[PDB]
């Protein structure tokens, strides 16, 4: 299959027509997405098969073909870019200054950008183009808008 680094749509033909259920990142031969996009199922890339290798429902993350490779972190000061890949629409960079999710176990950056559910998995990048996490797991706030955590895995 196609193994070139980059951002990819995750599609299904199970529902009406071809439906985009999410997005992910190919880096160093490993495909990275959010658990809720694939539910841990196998994926196809052309005639090739991508099998799950690691996953965790609480982190809402999954890697295919190898271990999680993404380890850049938001610096807590600077603007980042969401590389939004919405269903049926061209990849588009959106720049924003993250907010913060404060938890009993520490703080994480959060982006206040509202896209369709099939955009989940889209990468958030720093100024060097490194992926600091994936968009698509978050909360619905007072006015009904959406705020996503910047979800990042651990590189073993």
């Amino acid at each position: 299959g196609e193994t070139t680094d980059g951002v990819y749509r995750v599609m299904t033909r199970r529902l009406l027509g071809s439906t985009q259920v999410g997005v992910g990142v190919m880096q160093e031969g490993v495909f990275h997405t959010m658990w809720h996009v694939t539910k841990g199922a196998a994926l196809r890339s052309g005639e090739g098969r991508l099998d799950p290798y690691w996953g965790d429902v609480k982190q809402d993350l999954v890697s295919y073909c190898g271990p999680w490779k993404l380890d850049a972190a938001w610096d807590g000061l600077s603007e980042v870019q969401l590389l939004a890949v919405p269903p049926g629409e061209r990849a588009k960079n959106i720049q924003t200054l993250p907010g913060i999710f404060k938890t009993k176990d520490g703080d994480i950056g959060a982006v206040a950008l509202d896209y369709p559910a099939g955009t989940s998995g889209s990468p958030i990048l720093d100024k060097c183009g490194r992926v600091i996490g994936l968009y698509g797991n978050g909360v619905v706030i007072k006015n009904g808008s959406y705020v996503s955590a910047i979800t990042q895995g651990k590189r073993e």
Binding site: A42, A91, I94, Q95, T96, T103, K104, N137
Partner: protein, 39 residues
């Protein structure tokens, strides 16, 4: 049967559209991976 299709390179774009606010929220993360607001 899920399948993937390339949508682009991962790069920073100079002069991209700039939007969104920066809210500071108190949240809880449950065992199912769901975030919820804490008040």
């Amino acid at each position: 049967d899920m399948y993937i299709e390339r949508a682009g390179d991962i790069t920073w774009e100079k002069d991209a559209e700039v939007t969104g606010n920066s809210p500071r929220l108190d949240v809880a993360l449950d065992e199912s991976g769901d975030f919820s607001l804490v008040e």
